[PDB]
Symmetry: C2
Subunit: 157 residues, 2 copies
C-alpha cells in the first residue's frame, strides 16, 4: 500500500461513518459473519493529541459486540500504529471528509484489509470507483459490499 492521503487533517474525519465495502488479501479474513477482520465502523474520534480512536461493531461468540481501539499517530499524518503482539498499521488512503474515506489495515511480514467508509446509508458509486482504483494496486482475493437496509442494522445483519 503506497497510496496515502496528501495533506490529511485528522480532526475533520471525526463523527459518523458506515462501512459500505470491504476487501482483503486472504478469503478467510472476511469470509464469515465472525471472520477476524469483519469489523464495522460506527465512529471515528480523533484525540486532542492527534491519535485516532475507532468505535467498532463485530460479531463475537454468537452476538453483535461493541469495542473501542486507539490507533496512535506517527510522524506521517496518514499513518497510525496498532501495536499488539505484531506491529500493524492503519493508513488513510483518501477522503473528502464530507462523504467518503478509504483506509487499510496491514501487518509487517503481506496481509491486508481495506474499507470504503461513507457518511450516509447509501451506495455511492463514485466512492466505490475510487475504492476499486486503490484495490487494483493490491493483491485482494475477497470483496464484500452492503445494501442500505443492512447498513442501518447492527453488525449489518
Amino acid at each position: 500500500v503506497t497510496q496515502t492521503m496528501k495533506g490529511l487533517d485528522i480532526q475533520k474525519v471525526a463523527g459518523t461513518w458506515y462501512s459500505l465495502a470491504m476487501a482483503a488479501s486472504d478469503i478467510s479474513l472476511l469470509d464469515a459473519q465472525s471472520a477476524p477482520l469483519r469489523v464495522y465502523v460506527e465512529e471515528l474520534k480523533p484525540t486532542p493529541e492527534g491519535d485516532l480512536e475507532f468505535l467498532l461493531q463485530k460479531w463475537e461468540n454468537g452476538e453483535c459486540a461493541q469495542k473501542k481501539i486507539i490507533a496512535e499517530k506517527t510522524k506521517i499524518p496518514a499513518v497510525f500504529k496498532i501495536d499488539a503482539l505484531n506491529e500493524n498499521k492503519v493508513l488513510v488512503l483518501d477522503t473528502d471528509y464530507k462523504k467518503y474515506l478509504l483506509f487499510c489495515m496491514e501487518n509487517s511480514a503481506q496481509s491486508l484489509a481495506c474499507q470504503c467508509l461513507v457518511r450516509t446509508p447509501e451506495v455511492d458509486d463514485e466512492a466505490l470507483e475510487k475504492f476499486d482504483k486503490a484495490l487494483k494496486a493490491l493483491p485482494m482475493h475477497i470483496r464484500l459490499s452492503f445494501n442500505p437496509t443492512q447498513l442501518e442494522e447492527q453488525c449489518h445483519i
Copy 2:
C-alpha cells in the same frame, strides 16, 4: 442476466476446468467454505443428446465431497435448466473454448451466482476483465478469486 454466448457449440466446452473466480448477489451464498453456492467445477461433460453434465466438488458436513448434476438443454443453446423444487437456469455468458468460460446460475423470483472458469491453474487477467465486465451489469455483493496453489487442491483449501 442478458449476456449469453452467440453461436455456442456445446460439445467444445468438454473437459477440464478450474473455478478461478466466483461472485453472487447475496453475501451468504458464498461467504463460508460450506456456503451453498461455493461449488468448484472439475469437468464439464456435454451429452450426445445435448445436455450439460457438471462434475463438482463442495465442502459438505466437514469434508470435500464429489457430486454430478445434469443441466438439461432448452431451445436456446446457451441456456440450460436445473429444475428441482424451483426452476433454476444455467446460462453460458461467453467462452473461447481453449482458455476461459463464464456462466451464471439464477433462480426465477433475483438471486444469482456466476463463475470465471479457466482450462489451466493460473490467474488469467484477460479472462478476469471479461468476468468483471459481465458483472457490472448485475447486482453482485460478494466476489472471491483463487491463487494457483489453491486451484490445485481439493475444494481449493
